[PDB]
Curated annotation (Swiss-Prot), chains A, C:
Distribution of this protein across tissues and organs: Expressed in brain with higher levels in fetal brain. Found in cerebellum and occipital pole.
Notes on how activity is controlled: Activated by G-protein coupled receptors via direct interaction with GTP-bound GNAI3, which increases the channel sensitivity to phosphatidylinositol bisphosphate. May be activated by intracellular calcium store depletion. Calcium channel activity is enhanced by MYLK, that promotes its subcellular localization at the plasma membrane.
Task of the protein: Forms a receptor-activated non-selective calcium permeant cation channel. Mediates calcium-dependent phosphatidylserine externalization and apoptosis in neurons via its association with PLSCR1. Acts on distinct neuronal populations in the hypothalamus to regulate innate behaviors including feeding, anxiety (flight/fight/fear), socialization, and maternal care.
Subcellular location as annotated: Cell membrane
Glycosylation sites: 412
Name of the molecule in the record: Short transient receptor potential channel 5
Organism annotation: Homo sapiens (Human)
Binding site for Zn(2+): 140, 144, 146, 149
Amino acid sequence: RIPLQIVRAETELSAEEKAFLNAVEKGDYATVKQALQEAEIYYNVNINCMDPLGRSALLIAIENENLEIMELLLNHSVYVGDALLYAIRKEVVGAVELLLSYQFSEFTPDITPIMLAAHTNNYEIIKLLVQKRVTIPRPHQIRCNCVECVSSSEVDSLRHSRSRLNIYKALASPSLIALSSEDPILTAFRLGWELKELSKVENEFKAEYEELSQQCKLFAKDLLDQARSSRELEIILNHRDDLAKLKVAIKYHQKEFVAQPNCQQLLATLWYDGFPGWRRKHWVVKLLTCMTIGFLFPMLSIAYLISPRSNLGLFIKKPFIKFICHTASYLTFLFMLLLASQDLHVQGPPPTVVEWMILPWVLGFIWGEIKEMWDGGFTEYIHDWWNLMDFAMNSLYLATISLKIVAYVKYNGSRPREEWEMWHPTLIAEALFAISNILSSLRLISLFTANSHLGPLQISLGRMLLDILKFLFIYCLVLLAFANGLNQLYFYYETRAIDEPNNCKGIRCEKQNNAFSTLFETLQSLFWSVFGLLNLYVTNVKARHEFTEFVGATMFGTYNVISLVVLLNMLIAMMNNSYQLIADHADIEWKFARTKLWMSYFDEGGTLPPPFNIISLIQNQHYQEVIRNLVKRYVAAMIRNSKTHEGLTEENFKELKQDISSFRYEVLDLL
Amino acid sequence: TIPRPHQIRCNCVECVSSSEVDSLRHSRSRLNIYKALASPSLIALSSEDPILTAFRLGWELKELSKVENEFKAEYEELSQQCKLFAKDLLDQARSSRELEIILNHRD
Amino acid sequence: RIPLQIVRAETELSAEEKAFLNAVEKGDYATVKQALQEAEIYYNVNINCMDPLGRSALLIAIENENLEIMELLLNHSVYVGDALLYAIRKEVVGAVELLLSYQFSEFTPDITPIMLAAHTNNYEIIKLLVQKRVTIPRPHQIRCNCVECVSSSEVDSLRHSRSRLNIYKALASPSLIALSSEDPILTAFRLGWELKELSKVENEFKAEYEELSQQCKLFAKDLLDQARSSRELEIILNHRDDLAKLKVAIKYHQKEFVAQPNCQQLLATLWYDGFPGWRRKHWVVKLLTCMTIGFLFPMLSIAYLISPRSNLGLFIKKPFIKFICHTASYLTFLFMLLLASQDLHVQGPPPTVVEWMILPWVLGFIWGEIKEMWDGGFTEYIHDWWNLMDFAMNSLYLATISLKIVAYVKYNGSRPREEWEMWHPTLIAEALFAISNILSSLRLISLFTANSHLGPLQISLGRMLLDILKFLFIYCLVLLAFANGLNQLYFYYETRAIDEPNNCKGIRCEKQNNAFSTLFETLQSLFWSVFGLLNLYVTNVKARHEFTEFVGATMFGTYNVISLVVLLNMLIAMMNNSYQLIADHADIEWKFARTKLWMSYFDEGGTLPPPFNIISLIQNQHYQEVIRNLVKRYVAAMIRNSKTHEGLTEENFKELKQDISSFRYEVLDLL
Ligand SMILES: CC(C)CCC[C@@H](C)[C@H]1CC[C@H]2[C@@H]3CC=C4C[C@@H](OC(=O)CCC(=O)O)CC[C@]4(C)[C@H]3CC[C@]12C
Ligand SMILES: CC(C)CCC[C@@H](C)[C@H]1CC[C@H]2[C@@H]3CC=C4C[C@@H](OC(=O)CCC(=O)O)CC[C@]4(C)[C@H]3CC[C@]12C
Ligand SMILES: [Ca+2]
Ligand SMILES: [Ca+2]
Ligand SMILES: [Zn+2]
Ligand SMILES: [Zn+2]
Ligand SMILES: [Zn+2]
């Protein structure tokens, strides 16, 4: 048998005292008042005493919203401490007003009434608390190293982190940003960015800072949603302290704000500037118009170069026409690169007619990249992540040009390629040119963003490449390990190239040999084993060492089982799990990326596609009025949605029970 | 009375003027009209043929969903609501004659 | 502008008449009674009139559960029709009792009060209706062809199907089976089986019959769940009209009833008969005991053959020991089959020592199969779906024996196999023996059911083989189509075997040839193209018909794209979708299959593993008492669970509003 007792004993209540608390619970005003006036005389019943479940009489009256017993206890001067916070968390405006008019606690000591109101996100109570001059202390920097922060971290790191988290949850309140903020949209933007940075820094408290940042982004989105006219939309988007607030939203990565339908509609009607009725057109006439503009890019470009002030000169300044001209010029560049592959023994030859055409687009690409560098700056250049491969293309083109010039100057004769040197400058130049050709032709992935049916697909690829990168570390570790083992076994039986039937050594021969003789060749062989191009007899030696053969063969088999059966199917399962997490927000992310692509063409800089590129208090007052109407509409909408969602608990049933019982004792008293 | 929405691809002076002056209010007004018209109760009353009315309204809402790219989901859900209303109206039949009168009616 | 009107006009109410219905809605008894006694004199207010929303005064009083206005209207003799059914659907026992004591309708004409009560599944109302002698008409046979059924199908097939569905939904009520049934468990079993058959037949009304069958199975499971002692469990399982009811449940495929924890515990303690403490033992001692019993199967078998009445004779009659002995004998048979592969030029040789051992297990397997046939019967034999491959094994073994005997009798000499005939009886016999070896060795999949970690895996394979079978039709259609096309192109360039370098024709040669010359070889080639074993140069001819080559090559490429890229990934996606639908019920299905495997060993027949197999109203009364206690417990439990689930709608809020308003007019009248 197990004895049961109370190992942590407390102070029990007496019979009359339990009767008093029970009368408070059922709401008998006559009995409670009689007990109070009897206690004032006899000092028998403690009015500030506790209950078995953690509450006192004022707490019971507050949770049961019985304002009349609550004010009776206030008039009898019961203990008051933390009951204000209890009324704040209870969301009872009458209790809040009465306690403003005048041990164990389930609240942290930092909990201030404004902060608990900001947690409860109740606009009424937050505004009544803000009516009095009440202050929230400022959080320090994200990476602050001052003496106060290091002392608070050293003394009690749990209370420091809880205090910072408590401050930021107070500040991220949608009601507390709707009031007491000169610019709620910009405040929500900066607060969301800061909460994202604190989510990145504080690893353990990551999810709560993530959800606070998401709450701020949702608040900004709904505030934009409450607009009701195109002027108000453009006052919001064009406020600066054009499209300044939109550029700020793009800078702070507010994809929910950017992907608003009204903002996307305004961006679309700015994008289709020259064509007012592109929204309602057929597929065939859209394709015909696109090809018609795309076949006239040199005419429009030379029109801009000659006279910007004409029906054709400023026609390319429209964003869609500029995008079509850039795409058409780049596609003609790729067509010429395809034509370039269509005497070959000259050492360091002069450039042909096709390369003589290619050279100005190469110079224009380099000039455009360095012009974007010099104009935008550094962080904006490195943030794009396409400029890395753009730099790779420019570097490979420059290397090809330099090697071609070096070969043309240094060599003159016509020697057949069969006896050329292996590190010949012409060979190096042509290899670099082919690599740059591939990089140029995969640069077209960036144009899938502007299409409706390919943009989310590109977003899904960009989100699953991260998991491919995660898997590549494990696969390369396994590859290095098995390459090391197979080298350590097989590098005694290395054979010269002369002993081979056709003077070829390596896995690229007709008869594959020496697949595990050197570390480079072992890495190549175990890489090509994934696609099945490495035959089985590469695990063979001329000597009769059958045990050596069997250990090498089972090493190869273990590598194949780990890679193709385990790791590849692991990669399939990982990307399949990752795709479902992206399919929900793919539309929003695609709309954000397409907005960035659209705003990339709104500038006057970079207008000419290559190779042609080498040849004020009223605004504040109107914005304040629009935001004031927006805040009123948003508070009304979130009040309506609070009165439309579920919201109901057993609090409501015990509230109705309390009202019925208080009335019951009232009419039993009056009758 | 509810004012009539114009054509899906209408190019008249009133529509182009309303699109140019305030495109948000124009789109909100058209969306508001179509949400009013797609009401199952408002098709159950005031309609000479609720089944055919729901059919044509669902097709039109599908076309406006195809055209209006930004307001796609709401027109999709209105078309789905009209299709569900037609399905439930057919579901409420209680005899094979009524089923065949519904299926064999021609106008 | 669109005009709005009422195209289907109805009869509006007058002002006093709307006032009367509004007074009924708010529950003013004084106003309603005054209006009734004024209408009795003046005949100005119609008491049976309709409202704008389809109801009359009695309907409003019934839906608002206001029994006093309802009985007032009953005393004033308002229209009564279908208000009883309205009270049945409303689940108000007072309204039901009062209407029992005494146009447009949303109910079908077949709706009878007992049937609507059975739909509502309210035990109280169903019992009060059953107190009066009330009858439900019998549904006919599933495939009945009588004149009444064919006439009802021809006249109005919608009303006939709705009537049958209405009858079966009435009969499948858990309360209506808990009452008025001599055997609720057997009634639920037969009703679930019948509803499954009607689900199979009625294709359009499939889901509702499926959910009714599932409801009956759940009712039987919960009725078994309400047992509270091992005697009651065994009275339920051992009732017959041992384990007769359990065998009936297995026959009717009640997997939920079979997979009950108490039933599985009783089956386990019958299964581990000889070992009382196998439940609490270590893995190593379990493995040691299993190998110890498995190495002694001939000793236990010969002990049973010599003397069944001993410590070793009846030791094999225990189910676990019998299962271990069968498994050990069959594993030794497979070990001998492995040994059989370890002079070869004799035409029709005598059987060797290994085959002379194999022959009695072959005879024992055939004898056991025909004995199971003769004992169990026909449907039980063909239902197992393992007996098909068992028959295949027996037929191949018999064919091997017959061909070996024919070869031994007909041939005597010793000719080397290089010049044997291609259809030689020895060659045919050895091919059939190898095929039977594979079938014998994959017969071990059936033993994965008895294991804890492999049984659900076998269930998942058995459920995804259906989708593989579904996909195989499409793949074989594509295979036949592309084989036909490639034959029609390539059968002009068929070459003889002599013209080949090594006198070999077909895709099984060193140099693959003639892959699309005949239909059989084209089917083989396009089958082997799936696994990559068919090289690319099989699409080549000796002549210089390059267009012919290109069309053949692009046909091969189109087939590879359809098969490996589209169809194989389709199969992967289909099985991945199918696995998630099986992972939920895999435990229940595995427990059912393991119960079937356990009951297969409970019989005295088939005790000896091969080759050794060729060498009474008190029961009804106790069952009735146990079922009566079970029904009382189940009704109490489902009443408690009805008072524990959500169950609450705006009906409850308008009920409380009606009570408050009726009281309000009452006290305004009394004061
Ligand atoms: C991949 C196969 C078919 C070979 C063809 C290669 C290229 C000639 C293709 C592949 C990707 C194509 C691009 C994919 C997407 C677009 C966006 C498209 O713009 C839209 O979606 C129209 C609406 C809008 O811009 O608002 C204009 C054509 C373009 C650049 C396409 C131009 C032609 C490209 C470069
Ligand atoms: C597959 C590899 C490891 C080669 C070995 C082949 C056979 C020797 C294996 C494969 C499947 C095995 C069987 C899989 C499952 C079981 C059930 C197992 O029983 C239990 O799970 C114990 C608990 C119980 O029976 O209640 C007894 C051994 C047995 C027949 C195994 C016996 C050994 C088998 C035939
Ligand atoms: Ca760039
Ligand atoms: Ca059998
Ligand atoms: Zn600091
Ligand atoms: Zn118009
Ligand atoms: Zn009949």
